Amino acid sequence: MASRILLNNGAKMPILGLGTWKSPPGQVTEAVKVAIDVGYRHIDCAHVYQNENEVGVAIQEKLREQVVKREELFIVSKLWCTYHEKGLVKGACQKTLSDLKLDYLDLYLIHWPVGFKPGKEFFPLDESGNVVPSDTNILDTWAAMEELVDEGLVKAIGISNFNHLQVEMILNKPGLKYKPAVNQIECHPYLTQEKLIQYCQSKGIVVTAYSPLGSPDRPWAKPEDPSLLEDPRIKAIAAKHNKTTAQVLIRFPMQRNLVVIPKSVTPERIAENFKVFDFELSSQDMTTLLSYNRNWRVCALLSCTSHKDYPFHEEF
Ligand SMILES: NC(=O)c1ccc[n+]([C@@H]2O[C@H](COP(=O)([O-])OP(=O)(O)OC[C@H]3O[C@@H](n4cnc5c(N)ncnc54)[C@H](OP(=O)(O)O)[C@@H]3O)[C@@H](O)[C@H]2O)c1
Numbered sequence: 591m592a593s594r595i596l597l598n599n600g601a602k603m604p605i606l607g608l609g610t611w612k613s614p615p616g617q618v619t620e621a622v623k624v625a626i627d628v629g630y631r632h633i634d635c636a637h638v639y640q641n642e643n644e645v646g647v648a649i650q651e652k653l654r655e656q657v658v659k660r661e662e663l664f665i666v667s668k669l670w671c672t673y674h675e676k677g678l679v680k681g682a683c684q685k686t687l688s689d690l691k692l693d694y695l696d697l698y699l700i701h702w703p704v705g706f707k708p709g710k711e712f713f714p715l716d717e718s719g720n721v722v723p724s725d726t727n728i729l730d731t732w733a734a735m736e737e738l739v740d741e742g743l744v745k746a747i748g749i750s751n752f753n754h755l756q757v758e759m760i761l762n763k764p765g766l767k768y769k770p771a772v773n774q775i776e777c778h779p780y781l782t783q784e785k786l787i788q789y790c791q792s793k794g795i796v797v798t799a800y801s802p803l804g805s806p807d808r809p810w811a812k813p814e815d816p817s818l819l820e821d822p823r824i825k826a827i828a829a830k831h832n833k834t835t836a837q838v839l840i841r842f843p844m845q846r847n848l849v850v851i852p853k854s855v856t857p858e859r860i861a862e863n864f865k866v867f868d869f870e871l872s873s874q875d876m877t878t879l880l881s882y883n884r885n886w887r888v889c890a891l892l893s894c895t896s897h898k899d900y901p902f903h904e905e906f
Pocket residue numbers: 608609610611612634635701750751774775799800801802803804805806807808819834836837851852853854855856859860862863889
Protein backbone atom coordinates (compact mmCIF):
# COMPACT_ATOMS: atom_id res chain seq x y z
CA MET A 591 0.00 0.00 0.00
CA ALA A 592 1.05 3.50 -1.06
CA SER A 593 2.87 5.36 1.66
CA ARG A 594 1.60 8.88 0.74
CA ILE A 595 -1.73 10.52 -0.25
CA LEU A 596 -2.09 13.42 -2.67
CA LEU A 597 -3.29 16.74 -1.29
CA ASN A 598 -5.08 19.53 -3.21
CA ASN A 599 -1.89 21.57 -3.30
CA GLY A 600 -0.09 18.87 -5.32
CA ALA A 601 1.99 17.69 -2.32
CA LYS A 602 2.02 14.15 -1.00
CA MET A 603 1.39 13.46 2.66
CA PRO A 604 2.69 10.32 4.42
CA ILE A 605 -0.23 8.23 5.65
CA LEU A 606 1.52 7.28 8.89
CA GLY A 607 2.89 9.99 11.16
CA LEU A 608 4.10 10.35 14.72
CA GLY A 609 1.82 12.02 17.29
CA THR A 610 3.42 14.24 19.92
CA TRP A 611 0.63 15.25 22.35
CA LYS A 612 1.73 14.20 25.89
CA SER A 613 5.30 13.48 24.75
CA PRO A 614 7.12 15.30 27.53
CA PRO A 615 9.87 17.64 26.47
CA GLY A 616 12.32 15.58 28.51
CA GLN A 617 11.52 12.53 26.32
CA VAL A 618 10.23 13.73 22.90
CA THR A 619 13.56 14.58 21.29
CA GLU A 620 14.63 10.94 21.51
CA ALA A 621 11.20 9.79 20.31
CA VAL A 622 11.44 11.89 17.17
CA LYS A 623 15.04 10.84 16.52
CA VAL A 624 14.07 7.16 16.73
CA ALA A 625 10.95 7.71 14.60
CA ILE A 626 13.02 9.33 11.85
CA ASP A 627 15.57 6.50 12.04
CA VAL A 628 12.86 3.82 11.56
CA GLY A 629 11.20 5.59 8.68
CA TYR A 630 8.63 8.11 9.95
CA ARG A 631 8.57 11.19 7.76
CA HIS A 632 5.39 12.87 9.08
CA ILE A 633 5.31 14.46 12.55
CA ASP A 634 2.07 15.90 14.06
CA CYS A 635 2.77 18.85 16.31
CA ALA A 636 0.95 21.70 18.02
CA HIS A 637 1.86 24.83 19.95
CA VAL A 638 -0.42 23.76 22.81
CA TYR A 639 1.56 20.51 23.25
CA GLN A 640 4.37 22.69 24.71
CA ASN A 641 7.13 20.54 23.19
CA GLU A 642 7.74 22.04 19.73
CA ASN A 643 11.22 23.23 20.68
CA GLU A 644 12.23 19.65 21.58
CA VAL A 645 10.66 18.26 18.42
CA GLY A 646 12.62 20.87 16.47
CA VAL A 647 15.88 19.83 18.17
CA ALA A 648 15.43 16.26 16.96
CA ILE A 649 14.62 17.34 13.41
CA GLN A 650 17.63 19.64 13.27
CA GLU A 651 19.93 16.95 14.47
CA LYS A 652 18.76 14.39 11.92
CA LEU A 653 19.12 16.97 9.22
CA ARG A 654 22.66 17.72 10.30
CA GLU A 655 23.48 14.01 10.57
CA GLN A 656 22.50 13.58 6.88
CA VAL A 657 19.74 11.09 7.78
CA VAL A 658 16.95 12.96 5.98
CA LYS A 659 16.52 16.15 3.93
CA ARG A 660 13.86 18.75 4.76
CA GLU A 661 11.93 18.02 1.55
CA GLU A 662 11.34 14.42 2.70
CA LEU A 663 9.72 15.49 5.95
CA PHE A 664 6.04 16.42 6.40
CA ILE A 665 5.68 18.63 9.46
CA VAL A 666 2.23 19.57 10.72
CA SER A 667 1.35 22.09 13.37
CA LYS A 668 -1.83 23.80 14.55
CA LEU A 669 -3.07 27.29 15.47
CA TRP A 670 -4.23 27.29 19.08
CA CYS A 671 -7.69 28.61 20.10
CA THR A 672 -6.36 31.78 21.77
CA TYR A 673 -4.90 32.99 18.44
CA HIS A 674 -7.96 33.03 16.16
CA GLU A 675 -8.01 36.81 15.78
CA LYS A 676 -6.76 37.69 12.31
CA GLY A 677 -3.99 39.92 13.74
CA LEU A 678 -2.56 37.10 15.88
CA VAL A 679 -2.40 34.26 13.35
CA LYS A 680 0.89 35.07 11.64
CA GLY A 681 2.68 35.55 14.95
CA ALA A 682 1.39 32.22 16.23
CA CYS A 683 2.57 30.49 13.08
CA GLN A 684 5.97 32.17 13.28
CA LYS A 685 6.37 31.16 16.94
CA THR A 686 5.76 27.54 15.92
CA LEU A 687 8.25 27.88 13.06
CA SER A 688 10.84 29.38 15.40
CA ASP A 689 10.37 26.66 17.98
CA LEU A 690 10.51 23.90 15.38
CA LYS A 691 13.57 25.63 13.74
CA LEU A 692 11.87 25.43 10.36
CA ASP A 693 11.30 27.95 7.64
CA TYR A 694 7.98 26.43 6.52
CA LEU A 695 5.36 23.94 7.60
CA ASP A 696 3.94 21.32 5.27
CA LEU A 697 0.50 21.73 6.79
CA TYR A 698 -0.99 24.15 9.30
CA LEU A 699 -4.37 23.45 10.87
CA ILE A 700 -6.97 25.46 12.76
CA HIS A 701 -6.70 23.25 15.86
CA TRP A 702 -10.34 23.60 16.97
CA PRO A 703 -13.17 25.66 15.47
CA VAL A 704 -13.66 27.49 18.79
CA GLY A 705 -11.78 30.70 19.54
CA PHE A 706 -10.87 31.55 23.13
CA LYS A 707 -10.09 34.88 24.81
CA PRO A 708 -6.55 35.97 23.81
CA GLY A 709 -3.91 35.86 26.52
CA LYS A 710 -1.26 33.68 28.14
CA GLU A 711 -3.59 30.96 29.39
CA PHE A 712 -4.40 28.19 26.93
CA PHE A 713 -7.84 27.61 28.50
CA PRO A 714 -9.06 30.90 29.91
CA LEU A 715 -11.91 30.11 32.23
CA ASP A 716 -14.26 32.37 34.10
CA GLU A 717 -14.73 31.92 37.85
CA SER A 718 -17.35 29.23 37.28
CA GLY A 719 -15.27 27.11 34.87
CA ASN A 720 -16.71 27.97 31.49
CA VAL A 721 -14.25 28.71 28.69
CA VAL A 722 -14.11 32.38 27.85
CA PRO A 723 -14.69 32.71 24.10
CA SER A 724 -13.25 35.24 21.70
CA ASP A 725 -15.30 37.30 19.26
CA THR A 726 -13.78 35.51 16.27
CA ASN A 727 -15.41 33.42 13.55
CA ILE A 728 -14.32 30.56 11.38
CA LEU A 729 -14.31 32.46 8.08
CA ASP A 730 -12.09 35.32 9.24
CA THR A 731 -9.69 32.85 10.86
CA TRP A 732 -9.61 30.92 7.59
CA ALA A 733 -8.80 34.04 5.60
CA ALA A 734 -5.86 34.66 7.97
CA MET A 735 -4.67 31.06 7.40
CA GLU A 736 -4.80 31.63 3.62
CA GLU A 737 -2.40 34.54 3.98
CA LEU A 738 0.15 32.15 5.49
CA VAL A 739 0.16 30.16 2.25
CA ASP A 740 0.45 33.33 0.17
CA GLU A 741 3.49 34.41 2.20
CA GLY A 742 5.21 31.02 1.99
CA LEU A 743 5.13 30.16 5.66
CA VAL A 744 3.04 27.05 5.10
CA LYS A 745 2.49 24.85 2.02
CA ALA A 746 -1.06 23.73 2.83
CA ILE A 747 -3.76 24.69 5.34
CA GLY A 748 -6.51 22.66 6.89
CA ILE A 749 -8.81 22.25 9.86
CA SER A 750 -9.26 19.94 12.84
CA ASN A 751 -12.34 18.97 14.80
CA PHE A 752 -14.66 20.67 12.33
CA ASN A 753 -18.13 19.23 11.80
CA HIS A 754 -19.47 18.97 8.28
CA LEU A 755 -21.42 22.23 8.52
CA GLN A 756 -18.28 24.06 9.65
CA VAL A 757 -16.32 22.57 6.76
CA GLU A 758 -19.16 23.61 4.45
CA MET A 759 -18.93 27.20 5.76
CA ILE A 760 -15.35 27.41 4.53
CA LEU A 761 -16.06 25.68 1.23
CA ASN A 762 -18.90 28.06 0.50
CA LYS A 763 -17.02 31.24 1.48
CA PRO A 764 -17.29 33.83 -1.33
CA GLY A 765 -13.75 34.59 -2.56
CA LEU A 766 -12.23 31.45 -1.02
CA LYS A 767 -8.53 31.30 -1.95
CA TYR A 768 -7.60 27.82 -0.71
CA LYS A 769 -9.81 24.86 0.11
CA PRO A 770 -8.83 23.02 3.29
CA ALA A 771 -6.51 20.17 2.39
CA VAL A 772 -7.14 18.09 5.52
CA ASN A 773 -9.64 17.67 8.34
CA GLN A 774 -7.93 16.02 11.33
CA ILE A 775 -10.54 14.29 13.54
CA GLU A 776 -10.73 11.67 16.26
CA CYS A 777 -11.26 8.25 14.70
CA HIS A 778 -10.99 4.69 15.99
CA PRO A 779 -13.26 1.62 16.28
CA TYR A 780 -15.33 3.24 19.02
CA LEU A 781 -15.81 6.47 16.98
CA THR A 782 -15.76 5.38 13.35
CA GLN A 783 -16.87 8.72 11.84
CA GLU A 784 -18.62 7.11 8.83
CA LYS A 785 -20.69 10.20 7.88
CA LEU A 786 -17.97 12.83 8.36
CA ILE A 787 -15.35 10.73 6.49
CA GLN A 788 -17.81 10.21 3.62
CA TYR A 789 -18.51 13.94 3.56
CA CYS A 790 -14.85 15.02 3.57
CA GLN A 791 -13.69 12.43 1.07
CA SER A 792 -16.50 13.39 -1.34
CA LYS A 793 -15.25 17.01 -1.12
CA GLY A 794 -11.63 16.20 -1.91
CA ILE A 795 -10.45 16.73 1.74
CA VAL A 796 -8.06 14.21 3.26
CA VAL A 797 -8.97 12.93 6.68
CA THR A 798 -6.38 12.36 9.39
CA ALA A 799 -7.40 10.04 12.23
CA TYR A 800 -6.14 11.13 15.66
CA SER A 801 -6.15 9.11 18.86
CA PRO A 802 -6.24 5.85 16.86
CA LEU A 803 -5.26 3.85 19.97
CA GLY A 804 -7.97 5.55 22.06
CA SER A 805 -5.56 7.92 23.84
CA PRO A 806 -5.15 5.80 26.99
CA ASP A 807 -2.85 8.53 28.42
CA ARG A 808 -5.43 11.34 28.04
CA PRO A 809 -5.48 13.26 31.31
CA TRP A 810 -9.26 13.10 31.89
CA ALA A 811 -9.57 9.30 31.48
CA LYS A 812 -11.88 7.54 33.95
CA PRO A 813 -11.16 3.93 34.93
CA GLU A 814 -14.60 2.74 33.71
CA ASP A 815 -13.99 4.20 30.26
CA PRO A 816 -13.77 1.81 27.29
CA SER A 817 -10.19 0.80 26.45
CA LEU A 818 -9.36 -0.01 22.83
CA LEU A 819 -5.91 -1.43 23.40
CA GLU A 820 -7.26 -3.90 25.97
CA ASP A 821 -10.38 -4.90 23.98
CA PRO A 822 -10.26 -8.71 23.77
CA ARG A 823 -12.12 -8.72 20.46
CA ILE A 824 -9.41 -6.60 18.85
CA LYS A 825 -6.73 -8.69 20.57
CA ALA A 826 -8.20 -11.73 18.83
CA ILE A 827 -8.06 -10.03 15.41
CA ALA A 828 -4.41 -9.09 16.09
CA ALA A 829 -3.52 -12.64 17.19
CA LYS A 830 -4.96 -14.02 13.92
CA HIS A 831 -2.47 -11.83 12.00
CA ASN A 832 0.42 -12.30 14.42
CA LYS A 833 0.43 -8.55 15.01
CA THR A 834 -0.21 -6.46 18.11
CA THR A 835 -3.49 -4.74 18.90
CA ALA A 836 -1.82 -1.37 18.29
CA GLN A 837 -0.73 -2.51 14.79
CA VAL A 838 -4.30 -3.53 13.97
CA LEU A 839 -5.59 -0.17 15.23
CA ILE A 840 -3.11 1.69 13.01
CA ARG A 841 -3.71 -0.44 9.91
CA PHE A 842 -7.50 -0.02 10.27
CA PRO A 843 -7.67 3.69 9.28
CA MET A 844 -5.03 3.19 6.61
CA GLN A 845 -7.42 0.83 4.79
CA ARG A 846 -10.15 3.52 4.92
CA ASN A 847 -7.85 5.86 2.93
CA LEU A 848 -7.13 7.89 6.07
CA VAL A 849 -3.89 9.32 7.41
CA VAL A 850 -3.15 8.13 10.97
CA ILE A 851 -0.91 9.61 13.67
CA PRO A 852 -0.28 7.22 16.60
CA LYS A 853 1.69 8.73 19.51
CA SER A 854 4.47 7.06 21.47
CA VAL A 855 7.60 8.11 23.29
CA THR A 856 8.68 4.52 23.90
CA PRO A 857 11.33 3.50 21.34
CA GLU A 858 10.20 -0.09 20.92
CA ARG A 859 6.57 1.05 20.42
CA ILE A 860 7.61 3.74 17.91
CA ALA A 861 9.27 1.01 15.85
CA GLU A 862 6.31 -1.43 16.40
CA ASN A 863 3.77 1.09 15.29
CA PHE A 864 5.51 1.72 11.95
CA LYS A 865 5.50 -2.01 11.05
CA VAL A 866 2.06 -1.94 9.46
CA PHE A 867 2.83 -2.03 5.71
CA ASP A 868 3.40 -5.82 5.68
CA PHE A 869 -0.11 -7.20 6.37
CA GLU A 870 -3.74 -6.56 5.35
CA LEU A 871 -6.94 -6.65 7.47
CA SER A 872 -9.57 -8.74 5.72
CA SER A 873 -13.00 -7.55 4.63
CA GLN A 874 -14.44 -9.32 7.66
CA ASP A 875 -11.87 -7.72 9.96
CA MET A 876 -12.72 -4.26 8.62
CA THR A 877 -16.44 -4.94 8.97
CA THR A 878 -15.93 -6.27 12.50
CA LEU A 879 -13.91 -3.28 13.62
CA LEU A 880 -16.39 -0.82 12.14
CA SER A 881 -19.11 -2.69 14.05
CA TYR A 882 -17.55 -1.63 17.37
CA ASN A 883 -18.62 1.99 16.93
CA ARG A 884 -20.15 3.55 20.08
CA ASN A 885 -19.94 7.20 19.08
CA TRP A 886 -17.49 7.40 22.04
CA ARG A 887 -15.23 10.52 22.11
CA VAL A 888 -11.78 10.87 23.84
CA CYS A 889 -11.50 14.46 22.97
CA ALA A 890 -14.34 16.81 23.91
CA LEU A 891 -14.53 19.44 26.63
CA LEU A 892 -17.64 20.04 28.74
CA SER A 893 -16.31 23.55 29.44
CA CYS A 894 -16.65 24.33 25.70
CA THR A 895 -20.19 23.01 25.14
CA SER A 896 -21.78 26.50 25.28
CA HIS A 897 -19.37 28.00 22.72
CA LYS A 898 -21.14 29.16 19.55
CA ASP A 899 -18.76 27.03 17.46
CA TYR A 900 -18.64 23.93 19.64
CA PRO A 901 -18.39 21.18 17.02
CA PHE A 902 -20.05 18.13 18.57
CA HIS A 903 -23.72 19.11 18.97
CA GLU A 904 -24.27 18.23 15.26
CA GLU A 905 -24.64 14.57 14.37
CA PHE A 906 -21.55 14.95 12.19
N1 LIG B 1 -6.19 17.67 16.43
C1 LIG B 1 -6.55 17.40 17.69
O1 LIG B 1 -7.37 17.99 18.36
C2 LIG B 1 -5.83 16.18 18.29
C3 LIG B 1 -6.40 15.64 19.47
C4 LIG B 1 -5.82 14.47 20.03
C5 LIG B 1 -4.70 13.89 19.41
N2 LIG B 1 -4.12 14.52 18.28
C6 LIG B 1 -2.83 14.04 17.68
O2 LIG B 1 -3.00 12.63 17.53
C7 LIG B 1 -1.89 11.95 18.22
C8 LIG B 1 -2.32 10.56 18.64
O3 LIG B 1 -3.41 10.65 19.61
P1 LIG B 1 -3.21 10.50 21.18
O4 LIG B 1 -1.85 11.01 21.58
O5 LIG B 1 -4.43 11.10 21.79
O6 LIG B 1 -3.25 8.95 21.50
P2 LIG B 1 -2.98 7.53 20.79
O7 LIG B 1 -1.99 7.70 19.75
O8 LIG B 1 -4.33 6.97 20.50
O9 LIG B 1 -2.44 6.72 22.06
C9 LIG B 1 -1.14 7.07 22.61
C10 LIG B 1 -1.02 6.21 23.90
O10 LIG B 1 -0.82 4.86 23.48
C11 LIG B 1 0.37 4.31 23.96
N3 LIG B 1 0.95 3.46 22.96
C12 LIG B 1 1.50 3.82 21.75
N4 LIG B 1 1.88 2.81 21.02
C13 LIG B 1 1.56 1.71 21.76
C14 LIG B 1 1.77 0.33 21.48
N5 LIG B 1 2.30 -0.13 20.36
N6 LIG B 1 1.33 -0.54 22.48
C15 LIG B 1 0.77 -0.06 23.63
N7 LIG B 1 0.57 1.24 23.94
C16 LIG B 1 0.99 2.10 22.94
C17 LIG B 1 1.25 5.51 24.25
O11 LIG B 1 2.19 5.26 25.30
P3 LIG B 1 3.75 5.77 25.28
O12 LIG B 1 3.75 7.09 24.54
O13 LIG B 1 4.07 5.87 26.78
O14 LIG B 1 4.53 4.69 24.60
C18 LIG B 1 0.24 6.54 24.73
O15 LIG B 1 -0.14 6.34 26.10
C19 LIG B 1 -1.56 12.97 19.34
O16 LIG B 1 -0.35 12.71 19.99
C20 LIG B 1 -1.61 14.28 18.52
O17 LIG B 1 -0.44 14.38 17.76
C21 LIG B 1 -4.68 15.65 17.70
